[PDB]
Design a protein around this ligand. Structure first.
Ligand SMILES: CN(C)c1cccc2c(S(=O)(=O)NCCCCCC[C@@H]3NC[C@@H](O)[C@@H](O)[C@H]3CO)cccc12
Ligand code: NA
Ligand code: NA
Ligand code: NA
Length: 525
């Protein structure tokens, strides 16, 4: 079975699984479900969601509870149970950092500060965040991580685990960097020539080279170097794709490093992270912003020629489901709502206030649009042209305001010879202006099959096609709309949309319909 691998060519990306592009339609457990007994409270949600991939912690404390005494009993049960249900895994290495802290390191690590030292603030007080310049901590982390990758090498020959997250939300809250004597001696010295060269700067000390950014850039570099060494070590055993997940700073008004998790893959240090950690496949945003404009900005910032988009975490409340559409539209490889288990916990106000079948259904309904075409969509996104949108007004908390909302709820997409107009919250007949869904929930996906032909599926929206350029006196129409499915990679037609179903755009409710739309311009001379 070919190793999973993250491919990057001509500004596009693909997660190869079993020798073909793959989309993670994911679900992540709560933080305390990484035990054999908890899995019974995980699988039912995953089945109701229709997820294809489960993200779940593997904690350093549980594989090495006593130094040198490894315990993979949980990984054994997890692999077995995942294969019975024919789903894949993303393991989350919870080790030196989990939300800035060492809580998931073994007691023999997190209680021995002299061996495994913490961030010291400028005032000399100590934060519960392990310093990236602790060489013992780096060696011990790597050692245990290598043993986990050895376990996968020997016991996961068919790659049930497709990707590994190295640490969980690295960084420090409460300070910008380590100010320990140890860290001070490294900070008061020359910037590594390798960072100097890879970045277009001039040789000198950290303060000389970076000025006002020296403290935060230093923390990012040293953390990025720690996480690269761990990643190189593990890849040496088994070369799986490996990524880091970011405690986002607000992109539009971040405040100061330390209010947000300093030293993580924040938007302002993606250049240090990419220069300092070339072995880490991608940097993934953890999205809990509710407002469309902020979420949209995060997707824009994390999708780069050098960075595949993977929404490694997103809130599991209703408004977040629709962001699947712009995530896949940007060439996203995956999307994983956080806390999708029945272990009696909710991260409200971040996620849903109540976890129940309705909570899961909001995501099941969007994943039902993509599951039937997952391999075809993944290939089109890598090799060709895709688009995706979400309803761009959030749920509400006179005559003019209705015109203003109608306009805001109308999106244009340039598909080459054809444009699509996407509108939200209106009847399936006639042209009454959009008033939006209550709550906000719609979105659309389009892939280009040919100059005049598109794959379309959408949710609580209307999609309408039109020419992209004025025609030289020709007219245009829909040539054919087919609803169908892929079987063995072949298109099977179920029915033709026509008449009422294509007079007033293409109207989608909550049910899944995958369309092939063929447009034509025609002479009337
Ligand atoms: C509104 S805001 O978006 O601006 N602020 C939100 C900042 C907090 C988001 C933390 C998300 C955490 N990611 C790591 C997971 O393991 C888990 O701890 C999760 C919280 O449940
Ligand atoms: Na892609
Ligand atoms: Na065009
Ligand atoms: Na169908």
């Amino acid at each position: 079975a070919p190793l999973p691998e993250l491919l990057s060519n001509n500004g596009k990306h693909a997660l190869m699984v079993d020798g073909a592009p793959y989309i993670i339609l994911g679900s992540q457990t709560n933080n305390s479900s990484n035990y054999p007994d908890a899995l019974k409270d995980v699988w039912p949600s995953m089945e109701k969601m229709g997820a294809n991939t489960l993200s779940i912690p593997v904690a350093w404390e549980q594989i090495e509870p006593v130094e040198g005494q490894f315990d993979f009993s949980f990984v054994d049960v997890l692999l077995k149970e995942a294969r019975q249900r024919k789903v894949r895994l993303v393991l989350l290495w919870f080790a030196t950092w989990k939300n800035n802290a060492p809580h998931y390191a073994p007691a023999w690590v997190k209680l021995d500060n002299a061996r495994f030292p913490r961030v010291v603030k400028e005032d000399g007080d100590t934060l519960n965040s392990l310093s990236p310049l602790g060489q013992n901590t780096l060696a011990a982390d790597k050692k245990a991580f290598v043993e986990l990758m050895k376990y996968l090498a020997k016991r996961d020959k068919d790659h049930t685990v497709i990707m590994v997250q190295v640490q969980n939300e690295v960084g420090t809250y409460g300070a910008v960097r380590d100010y320990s004597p140890m860290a001070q001696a490294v900070f008061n010295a020359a910037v590594p020539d390798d960072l100097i060269q890879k970045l277009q700067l001039k040789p000198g000390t950290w303060s000389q080279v970076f000025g006002r950014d020296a403290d935060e850039f230093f923390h990012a570099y040293q953390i990025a170097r720690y996480c690269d060494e761990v990643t190189v070590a593990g890849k040496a055993i088994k070369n799986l794709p490996m990524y880091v997940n970011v405690a986002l700073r607000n992109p539009f008004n971040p405040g100061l490093p330390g209010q947000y998790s300093s030293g993580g893959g924040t938007d302002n240090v993606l250049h240090i992270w990419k220069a300092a950690a070339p072995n880490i496949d991608l940097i993934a945003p953890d999205i809990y912003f509710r407002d469309y404009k902020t979420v949209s900005k995060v997707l824009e910032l994390y999708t780069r020629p050098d960075n595949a988009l993977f929404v490694a975490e997103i809130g599991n409340d209703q408004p977040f489901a629709r962001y699947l559409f712009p995530t896949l539209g940007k060439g996203g490889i995956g999307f994983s709502p956080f806390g999708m288990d029945d272990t009696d916990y909710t991260n409200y106000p971040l996620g849903a206030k109540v976890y129940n079948d309705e909570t899961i259904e909001q995501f099941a309904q969007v994943y039902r649009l993509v599951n039937p075409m997952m391999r075809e969509w993944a290939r089109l996104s890598y090799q060709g042209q895709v688009w995706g949108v979400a309803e761009p007004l959030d749920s509400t908390t006179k005559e003019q305001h209705k015109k203003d909302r109608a306009s805001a709820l109308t999106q244009q997409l340039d598909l080459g010879l054809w444009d699509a107009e996407v509108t939200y919250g209106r009847p399936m007949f006639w042209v009454t202006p959009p008033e939006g869904n209550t709550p906000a929930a719609g979105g659309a996906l389009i892939a280009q099959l040919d100059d005049n032909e598109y794959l379309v599926t959408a949710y609580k929206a209307r999609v309408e096609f039109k020419p992209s350029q004025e025609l030289a006196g020709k007219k245009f129409m829909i040539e054919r709309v087919e609803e169908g499915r892929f079987e063995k990679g072949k298109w099977v037609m179920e029915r033709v949309w026509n008449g009422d179903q294509t007079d007033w755009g293409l109207n989608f409710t909550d049910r899944p319909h995958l369309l092939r739309v063929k447009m034509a311009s025609y002479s009337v001379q």
